[PDB]
Design a protein around this ligand. Structure first.
Ligand SMILES: Cc1cc2nc3c(=O)[nH]c(=O)nc-3n(C[C@H](O)[C@H](O)[C@H](O)COP(=O)(O)OP(=O)(O)OC[C@H]3O[C@@H](n4cnc5c(N)ncnc54)[C@H](O)[C@@H]3O)c2cc1C
Length: 523
């Protein structure tokens, strides 16, 4: 049982759909999942308050009419256990797990150029041959565990948001220090403060977060959206970010001072990702961004009592939406509490831990528990952990030395029959990852169907097409405030910034043209 049509790497949203979609075509699939279960990010990232940025109705599979009609999302923005349960249900329903080997990390993928097959190796001693290697490794992997001197000396509990205990952690009676104010921090903090004796948030750089405005979903409104699902999907697929939301017609500056608060208020209510896109120039024109930045500032100044904390909570120079806006539930309110202190790591950096807590420049902090609220690795993080050896035995990491280069994100010269899902060259995290996963898997499925219909052995990014795409990605991005020096989207600005629908049209039209920009390879 060495060979399969497709080896999929990862059993998250993309991988799960990959298995289903590829098998529905009659392709044998072997998926490898490093985790013990399916879910990907929703499996591993299970710290308190872990919640989706995108309405559960959009952030969910559309490939299965039934699943859509049957699954009831409990709220506007599904928490991680719910999304997990959902993906677990998907795996149950579509019998996905049998083709997945869990606790199995793909270590290398080596191209046999003579046969256009990938030999996929694993840390469990799997050696499989794939006609196609589909990496669904996800765009979000763990940032390095922050290394603190004497962390190994701390007697209290050290918990990482990245490896949250499945049975949870009681913060009751506990003096808790939270290091990290990314989303994992922003989402866990309010919950930690709710039960902690005392919360110390050690903040180095403040981030933009906006209220989730997560509402429970009753039956009445659920049946309504379920009945209008196809239309909402249509809007989403044609949309900029994979959700049925269009930015305002006129630009931020072109609209009245009055009508600017009225729409910012509207985009404040619905979502964090979407507030970044209230106005069409919001993430392109620095002055237009200042307006959102100022609207945000004021909101937080209002909700946070102590103005010194409010200012500390305010991100210093960064453009709002440059770093993906975190969505929170009662996070800034959390600082109104008597049992939470925000420690400004710019004033008093952490110099280390001792037996009893965190030693900053200024104070020692008696803590029973330290929560390392970790951020996320570059889009290429999971991919970079793989040795993917393409043509000439040139490694993917090597061909990406000067920045990821792809055609559409889906083709890389030297890497035939290799597909990196929702990664550099595609909208990736800039779009609804469920729908983006669907798009990409579908596109790969179609490409495979295309090659199979014609007795073709392989498909390959053309060096000319990738050069062109690298350029097109560069140019869609040179305009953006996401293309700032501080930006996580860099490696080269990696995601395609033209919009999900525009991108969908582009890759569909490439497919429809007989894969222009790809070489179709024979036996
Ligand atoms: C709190 C939070 C909220 C979010 N909200 C949203 C949202 O609202 N909308 C949105 O579009 N995105 C959101 N994201 C981004 C999220 O990363 C993606 O939506 C999601 O991961 C896409 O699923 P995936 O299958 O592409 O990747 P993942 O969910 O990461 O699944 C990838 C899987 O591949 C595995 N893997 C990686 N490398 C290997 C290897 N070498 N061998 C074996 N297995 C491997 C990983 O273990 C993982 O299980 C959110 C992220 C966080 C942390």
């Amino acid at each position: 049982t060495t060979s399969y049509d497709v080896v999929v790497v990862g059993a998250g949203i993309a991988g799960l759909y990959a298995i289903h979609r590829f098998r529905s075509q009659g392709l044998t699939v072997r998926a490898f999942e490093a985790a013990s279960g399916v879910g990907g990010v929703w499996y591993w990232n299970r710290y308190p308050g872990a919640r989706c940025d995108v309405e559960s109705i959009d952030y969910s599979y559309s490939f299965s009419p039934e699943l859509e009609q049957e699954w009831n999302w409990s709220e506007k923005y599904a928490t991680q256990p719910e999304i997990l349960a959902y993906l677990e249900h998907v795996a149950d329903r579509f019998d996905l797990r049998r083709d997945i080997r869990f606790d199995t990390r793909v270590t290398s993928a080596v191209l046999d150029e003579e046969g256009l097959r990938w030999t996929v190796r694993t840390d469990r001693g799997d050696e499989v041959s794939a006609r196609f290697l589909v990496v669904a490794a996800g765009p979000l992997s763990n940032a390095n565990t922050p290394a603190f001197d004497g962390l190994d000396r701390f007697t209290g509990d050290i918990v990482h948001t990245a490896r949250w205990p499945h049975d949870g952690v009681d913060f009751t009676g506990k003096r808790v220090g939270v290091i990290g104010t990314g989303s994992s921090g922003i989402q866990s903090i309010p919950i930690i403060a709710e039960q902690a004796e005392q919360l110390f948030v050690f903040q180095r750089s403040a981030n933009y977060s906006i209220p989730a405005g997560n509402v429970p979903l009753d039956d009445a409104t659920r049946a309504e959206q379920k009945a209008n699902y196809a239309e909402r999907r249509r809007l989403s697929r044609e949309s900029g970010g994979g959700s049925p939301h269009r930015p305002h017609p006129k630009s931020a500056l072109e609209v009245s001072e009055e009508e600017r608060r009225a729409v910012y208020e509207e985009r404040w209510k619905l979502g964090g990702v979407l507030f970044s896109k209230a106005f069409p120039d919001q993430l392109t024109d620095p002055a237009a961004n200042d307006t959102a930045r100022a609207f945000w500032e004021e909101k937080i100044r209002a909700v946070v009592d102590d103005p010194a904390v409010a200012e500390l909570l305010t991100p210093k120079d960064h453009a709002i939406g440059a770093k993906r806006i975190v969505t929170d539930s009662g996070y800034y309110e959390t600082y109104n509490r008597d049992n939470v202190e925000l420690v400004d790591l710019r004033s008093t950096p952490i110099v280390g831990m001792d037996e009893t807590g965190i030693v900053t420049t200024g104070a020692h902090y008696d803590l029973d528990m330290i929560v390392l609220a970790t951020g996320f690795d570059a889009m290429t993080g999971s991919l970079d952990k793989l040795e993917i050896v393409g043509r000439g035995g040139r490694t993917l990491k090597e061909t990406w030395a000067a920045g990821p280069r792809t055609y559409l994100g889906l083709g890389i010269d030297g890497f035939p029959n290799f597909f990196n899902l929702t990664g550099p060259g595609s909208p990736s995290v800039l779009a609804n990852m469920v729908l983006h996963s669907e798009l990409h898997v579908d596109w790969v499925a179609d490409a495979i169907a295309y090659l199979d219909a014609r007795g073709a052995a392989g498909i390959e990014g053309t060096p000319e097409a990738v050069a062109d795409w690298v350029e097109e990605c560069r140019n869609r991005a040179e305009a953006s405030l996401l293309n700032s020096a501080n930006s996580w989207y860099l490696g080269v600005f990696m995601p395609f910034l033209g919009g999900f629908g525009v991108y969908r049209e582009i890759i569909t039209e490439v497919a429809e043209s007989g894969y222009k920009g790809f070489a179709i390879l024979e036996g």
